[PDB]
Symmetry: C2
Subunit: 125 residues, 2 copies
Amino acid sequence: NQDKIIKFQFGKFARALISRNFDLFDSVIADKVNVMGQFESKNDFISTLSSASSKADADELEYLSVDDYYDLKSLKISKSNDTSFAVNVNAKKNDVTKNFPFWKERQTLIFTTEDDNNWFLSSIN
Amino acid sequence: NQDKIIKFQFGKFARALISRNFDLFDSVIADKVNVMGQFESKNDFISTLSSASSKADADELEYLSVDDYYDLKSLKISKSNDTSFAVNVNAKKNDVTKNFPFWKERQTLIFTTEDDNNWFLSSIN
């Protein structure tokens, strides 16, 4: 049931977003991530996330809901091949997401494994 | 405006809860915390939190809202003296909170400073 592992890794992505703790991303994002057709190092992609996060300059208790980033009822998980899953979800535009240039209403996330153990985010679009 | 520092520290407490990342608690909880009239070491209190968290054995995408732990509209912050603030908030009973023995519907959190720089959680009841 790798579908549940992908839901866990997506959950970890979302929990990192809402908690603004970007150290949880290091176990979720691959060493290279294709962000809108362009490859970026894990660290450059994570620093995009934190930098955009701080750009929003929102209330300390604002946007502490997954509901503020995603319509979880829209969530779809689909095995694309042996080493690849596609997550499709409807995402929302908030004062933080508007700062993320890769952020789309119709979001595609690819999770890829290279050791058949660890499923990391390798593409976001 | 220390009121905003306390709201930030409470926010950090809440973000740790929702994210299930208990490493963010190490900057929020004091070395000793009075849990329901009894003092506990920071680590013993944090291990109560994570252990209870895992007892709930909930869906990966369940309880990713501050709304699931607290009525933020109930939140009240009140300076008690020079080194002490009281946070009062109405908390909710979920499949995780029911595992926390100290968890009450009417929650009192005391934030104390010993260096007039850092406000840590020193009591929960």
